[PDB]
Amino acid sequence: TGDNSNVVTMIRAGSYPKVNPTPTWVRAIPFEVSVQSGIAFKVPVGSLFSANFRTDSFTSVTVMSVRAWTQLTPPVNEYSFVRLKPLFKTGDSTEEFEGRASNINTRASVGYRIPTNLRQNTVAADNVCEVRSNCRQVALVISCCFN
Amino acid sequence: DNSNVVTMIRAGSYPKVNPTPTWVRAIPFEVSVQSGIAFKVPVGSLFSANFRTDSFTSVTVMSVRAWTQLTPPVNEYSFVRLKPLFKTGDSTEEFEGRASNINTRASVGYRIPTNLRQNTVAADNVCEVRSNCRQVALVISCCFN
Amino acid sequence: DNSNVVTMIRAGSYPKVNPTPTWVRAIPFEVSVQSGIAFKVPVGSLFSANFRTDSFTSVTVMSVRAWTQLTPPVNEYSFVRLKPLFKTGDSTEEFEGRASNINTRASVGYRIPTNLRQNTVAADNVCEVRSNCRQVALVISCCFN
Amino acid sequence: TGDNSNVVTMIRAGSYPKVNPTPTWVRAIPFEVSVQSGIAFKVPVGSLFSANFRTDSFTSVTVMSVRAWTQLTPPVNEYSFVRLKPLFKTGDSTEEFEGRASNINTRASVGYRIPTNLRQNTVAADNVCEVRSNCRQVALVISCCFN
Amino acid sequence: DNSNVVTMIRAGSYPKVNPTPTWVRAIPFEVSVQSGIAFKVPVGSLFSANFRTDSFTSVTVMSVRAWTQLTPPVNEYSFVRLKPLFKTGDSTEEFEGRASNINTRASVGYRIPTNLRQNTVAADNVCEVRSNCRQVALVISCCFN
Amino acid sequence: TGDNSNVVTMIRAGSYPKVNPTPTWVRAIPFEVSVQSGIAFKVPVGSLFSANFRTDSFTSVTVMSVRAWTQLTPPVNEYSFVRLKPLFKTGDSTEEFEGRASNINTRASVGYRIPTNLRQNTVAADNVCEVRSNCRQVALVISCCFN
Amino acid sequence: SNVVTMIRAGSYPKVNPTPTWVRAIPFEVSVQSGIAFKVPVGSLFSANFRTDSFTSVTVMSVRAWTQLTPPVNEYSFVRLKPLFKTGDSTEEFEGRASNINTRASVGYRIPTNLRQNTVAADNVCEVRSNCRQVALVISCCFN
RNA sequence: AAAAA
RNA sequence: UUUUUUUU
RNA sequence: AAAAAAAAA
RNA sequence: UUUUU
RNA sequence: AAAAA
RNA sequence: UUUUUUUU
RNA sequence: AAAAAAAAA
RNA sequence: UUUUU
RNA sequence: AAAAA
RNA sequence: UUUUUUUU
RNA sequence: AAAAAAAA
RNA sequence: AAAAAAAAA
RNA sequence: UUUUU
RNA sequence: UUUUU
Ligand SMILES: [Mg+2]
Ligand SMILES: [Mg+2]
Ligand SMILES: [Mg+2]
Ligand SMILES: [Mg+2]
Ligand SMILES: [Mg+2]
Ligand SMILES: [Mg+2]
């Protein structure tokens, strides 16, 4: 009910409201994972909790979607690619959502969305997905909900 | 999307990212107040791991609300005053709210105009607090950056 | 209410009160200016019992207007210049107004944008004033708090 | 004619306007008065003029309405009450606008409005109204016009 | 006015003039950045005869955009980070933009809100810059005054 | 696409745009020229380029219109007047746009507009117009385009 | 585009190397105290007005302004008595200034039938004033 | 969105 | 668009 | 059946 | 609606 | 845009 | 406008 | 078929 | 639309 | 506001 | 809504 | 002769 | 018959 | 919009 | 409408 103005204005507050000193937070976390040739890597959920993301105070998180980009150049004569295999505590998926680059100098991107019925919390000991690529590193952007 | 399995996302280029973004918050905390003496509420109280804000170093306050946290002296009704402070020049307003029931908290608050919403660091103060009660609860609405 | 007697007011709870509120004002005062020398108008001139503002210690200026208070030198028309000053960084504008009649005051003024309307204390200055006249009258629109 | 913007803008001022270094002020003054049992107290207008209200520069004021709240607890076994008898230099009123509390822990409130035909100036030597109450103190909020 | 000759102007009184007005500008310049070290971009870079702004002493920044000026290290894609700084309190945001092609610049930028658009002098800094490239080009939109 | 808000917001910038470190500037330059009795004075364009106008970095300018005001009192018993004769490198005009004051205490003003077909650049060695007046000084306000 | 084009002209048109010209001529005349000054039409034919090639002119209106200050304690005034070759008039169109520092202005319009040509020897109107140098602006048609 | 009047 | 020179 | 803010409904 | 820019 | 109810 | 004194 | 901003479409 | 004032 | 195509 | 498995 | 060719 | 500000109408 | 109709 | 974000 208050805007404009150039000086302080009195607020007619009432009863003490419902408060929460540690609220939730919807985020997209950008971090990188190194990857080997012909070998899959399980991305740990623990990478999401860090002071570099203002999330070191959380212990759980609900992932919503994962997106992966190749972070380094591919091998000689090759185009970049990156695969994603979703992992769940109730049962690992066998999908391999793959995306390849059409220009050797361009990143390779791919992503997958977690359905509502599978959006449960994950802790640092859990894994998000498996990453396969010919590039030595892969950049990730995970849309999740810390709680 | 009413679906029961993972579906592929056809991502394109790498987007603009930010690992340490801003945050609009309402921070609840308490301060001890002595009788007849004004207590300067420090900005550093907003930065704390108890509020997930220990990674921030500056904050832009939007409004300050106060509630008496303990019972008033005998035969008296609760009251609480707020005097906004600013690094460009402290104000002399004394926004006061009194309780109509001896068992009920006293409440008052003020809004900072847009032209006075600059950052404040831990060494700064937001306002002075006066009350006949020994503790005052505050719920400060601010934007951490 | 077209009534000729006192009528009862059915008051309820005690409302939020403020004994020392803010005040939007237009303060008229004069300053002495020497020829070829810029005079820094101090903010402390706004705080005075002559303006009912001796209880304030900070003020947020919105606009500054100036008028030459005395006659210009012989054969010359009056003029007056204003250079806004700010604690974050003084500006170099010289808003100038000249008189088209030797018997008429010269006038000019500037507006401070919203993003530059922060408090100023008595030790601060608002702007520099230049004129061929010995005195300049100012009517500063500000918000005392 | 000027708003928005991010820098100073030139104002094309004209003739020297009509000025007033000491303007009027409409206010609501909150102050307290102690009260005795079974004894009325005449509230002096002089309480309105003080540096605590930024009004020490005034010598006259035009009261518009008076509102009174009990400031301390009532006697044991009793509910709080407060009366108001308007006072005027042209003739004191005999009204006793009373308000009682329905909860022993709650304030008692009452007020009265001065009609336009009786809104003349009052100085420090004058009185506003008489206050009667069983509570040792009474809080007042007077809507007036200093001039 | 589709006319081919000079036409008379029926001027009246002398208008309000300003020989040193303000100026909204987009200043392009470059800075050298070392690997793993944040470079504080000084405000004094905006004041230069190369930008016709050597007559100004203060400036109000509105937005900052950055582009990597040189090629990234071998096997790496370009990136650039920006951390806005303010005299009232430095922020901790790290707005980052990465290039999807090793031969393409990385770009990112941030906007300063109205409540944080105060003047900055040459001794001040606008933001920190991090990048794997050795140089970063910036196009700062500001208002010289 | 960005306004309101109270904190910094990320801009999703793209390719490096087209830049210009030394852009043009439309200005109205106020400066004074002394004038003699019965003698014309050629106003040099070089007066427009100065650090007092933030224009010392320019070497050319396209004048659009000229306006002249008398700056000092006229001779005794006389009303003020001021004439303007436009000057052009392709051919000086013979017009004498004159304006006289109807009150001895009032300035005398006159101006002229340069047509689009004659709006070419002028350098410091060039002249704008000739000024004639009975007042010892004349004030000018030239609407031009520095480039 | 922004360059020349060709005009497909036809037969040689009707020409006139010395056409007419409507003008408003400003000039001043010296006036004595209590004496009426006859303004000669020849003052309109001058190289200072690009009119030294004309020998006749058709006057439409006359407007007068005092050019110098009035005597001490007096307000400026100026009178205009129209003159015509077919018969001098007796009107004294007078204008007075409500400010001692302000010019006194007056004028008169010539009707459309009394607008015949006048040569340099002819006079246009008498001028009276307490100021010494009344200025004139005459709207006329040179031919 | 010809010029003087 | 009151007139005159230029102007489809 | 014209643009706002500050104190008092 | 009062009143102060 | 009478007062008490 | 439920009523009573005042009130065109 | 009511007033905004911050992070995630 | 989610969610934090 | 099923999934692959 | 082009098709196939699931799906009133 | 009443549409097209080069530049915008 | 799309969102603003700065200097010049 | 230049050239050609 | 010119022009600078
Ligand atoms: Mg790759
Ligand atoms: Mg590509
Ligand atoms: Mg009580
Ligand atoms: Mg109660
Ligand atoms: Mg003059
Ligand atoms: Mg005048």
Side-chain angles (χ1 to χ4, degrees), chain D residues 109-123:
Chain D
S109 60
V110 72
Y112 75 93
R113 173 192 167 273
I114 301 179
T116 302
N117 48 285
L118 289 174
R119 289 186 176 185
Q120 292 78 41
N121 279 332
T122 54
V123 295

Side-chain angles (χ1 to χ4, degrees), chain G residues 54-55 62 96 110:
Chain G
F54 293 97
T55 62
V62 175
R96 306 183 193 176
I110 303 178

Side-chain angles (χ1 to χ4, degrees), chain B residues 3-23:
Chain B
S3 180
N4 301 315
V5 283
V6 291
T7 55
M8 180 145 57
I9 301 179
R10 291 176 171 82
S13 302
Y14 191 91
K16 315 301 178 181
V17 298
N18 188 11
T20 58
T22 58
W23 209 359

Side-chain angles (χ1 to χ4, degrees), chain B residues 75-78 92-93 98-103, chain D residues 30 32 54 70-73 80 105-107 139:
Chain B
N75 307 327
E76 296 186 18
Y77 291 88
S78 299
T92 48
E93 281 67 65
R98 305 184 190 177
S100 301
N101 190 316
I102 60 178
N103 301 324
Chain D
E32 285 64 49
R54 314 183 187 274
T70 55
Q71 189 69 353
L72 300 179
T73 51
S80 306
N105 302 326
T106 308
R107 297 176 180 263

Side-chain angles (χ1 to χ4, degrees), chain B residues 52-101:
Chain B
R52 311 183 189 274
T53 59
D54 52 320
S55 59
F56 291 94
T57 61
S58 306
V59 67
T60 300
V61 182
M62 295 187 298
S63 63
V64 176
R65 293 180 296 170
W67 289 266
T68 60
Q69 186 65 10
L70 298 177
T71 52
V74 58
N75 307 327
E76 296 186 18
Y77 291 88
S78 299
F79 79 91
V80 56
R81 306 193 187 105
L82 295 178
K83 185 179 71 178
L85 304 172
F86 301 94
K87 291 187 292 185
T88 52
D90 303 327
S91 65
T92 48
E93 281 67 65
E94 287 285 357
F95 305 109
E96 183 173 359
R98 305 184 190 177
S100 301
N101 190 316

Side-chain angles (χ1 to χ4, degrees), chain E:
Chain E
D1 273 2
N2 302 8
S3 180
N4 301 315
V5 283
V6 291
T7 55
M8 180 145 57
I9 301 179
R10 291 176 171 82
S13 302
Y14 191 91
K16 315 301 178 181
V17 298
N18 188 11
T20 58
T22 58
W23 209 359
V24 178
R25 292 285 302 276
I27 306 302
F29 67 98
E30 296 74 32
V31 294
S32 297
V33 178
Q34 305 184 228
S35 296
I37 302 175
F39 176 84
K40 301 179 183 300
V41 179
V43 178
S45 302
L46 302 175
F47 307 104
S48 174
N50 298 324
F51 310 119
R52 311 183 189 274
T53 59
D54 52 320
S55 59
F56 291 94
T57 61
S58 306
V59 67
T60 300
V61 182
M62 295 187 298
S63 63
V64 176
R65 293 180 296 170
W67 289 266
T68 60
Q69 186 65 10
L70 298 177
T71 52
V74 58
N75 307 327
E76 296 186 18
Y77 291 88
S78 299
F79 79 91
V80 56
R81 306 193 187 105
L82 295 178
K83 185 179 71 178
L85 304 172
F86 301 94
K87 291 187 292 185
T88 52
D90 303 327
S91 65
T92 48
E93 281 67 65
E94 287 285 357
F95 305 109
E96 183 173 359
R98 305 184 190 177
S100 301
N101 190 316
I102 60 178
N103 301 324
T104 304
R105 304 171 176 262
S107 61
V108 77
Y110 68 91
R111 177 186 176 272
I112 304 177
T114 296
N115 53 283
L116 287 176
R117 289 181 180 181
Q118 292 78 43
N119 275 336
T120 51
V121 297
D124 309 335
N125 300 320
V126 290
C127 60
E128 290 186 2
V129 175
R130 297 178 172 272
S131 173
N132 55 340
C133 303
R134 296 221 65 186
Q135 291 192 22
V136 170
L138 293 87
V139 181
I140 298 180
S141 305
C142 52
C143 304
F144 290 93
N145 68 98

Side-chain angles (χ1 to χ4, degrees), chain A residues 34-36 70-75 80-81 133-138:
Chain A
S34 305
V35 181
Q36 295 195 34
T70 55
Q71 189 69 353
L72 300 179
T73 51
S80 306
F81 78 92
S133 177
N134 55 8
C135 300
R136 316 214 80 187
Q137 293 188 16
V138 171

